[PDB]
Design a protein around this ligand. Sequence first.
Ligand SMILES: Cc1cn([C@H]2C[C@H](OP(=O)(O)O)[C@@H](COP(=O)(O)O)O2)c(=O)[nH]c1=O
Ligand SMILES: [Ca+2]
Length: 129
Amino acid sequence: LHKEPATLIKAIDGDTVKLMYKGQPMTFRLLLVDTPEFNEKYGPEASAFTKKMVENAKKKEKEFDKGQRTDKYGRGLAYIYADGKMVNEALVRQGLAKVAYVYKGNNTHEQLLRKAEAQAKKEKLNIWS
Ligand SMILES: Cc1cn([C@H]2C[C@H](OP(=O)(O)O)[C@@H](COP(=O)(O)O)O2)c(=O)[nH]c1=O
Ligand SMILES: [Ca+2]
């Protein structure tokens, strides 16, 4: 896979961000993770984490996987990076997202994220507390 520039319009919540992609405003859904909804426990916290990680990065990037690049709702599907740190991974590592929605052919970082999730579980962080 490779990274490409992401043009942030705005944070949305723990696992969705609004990007300008080829001049179209699109919701992007983070691959391989599930954050709580905003008003569920850990929701505000996941939102805030994703929001600050992406907003504060000088270098914002996205990375499509090998399979589908949009979902059935027209949302983009990508891994998002903030100064070369993957947001998807960091959410999972901090126990603010579960590994989720793992579909074959769009699952390149699956093992990386499962490693992160096991350590968040070991540490009893957030979702796993
Ligand atoms: C992350 C992801 C979600 N989705 C779909 C599955 C779920 O559809 P159903 O809505 O029909 O249950 C929905 C979950 O999104 P949210 O967790 O953003 O609600 O998005 C994909 O199709 N591909 C993906 O990679
Ligand atoms: Ca969610």
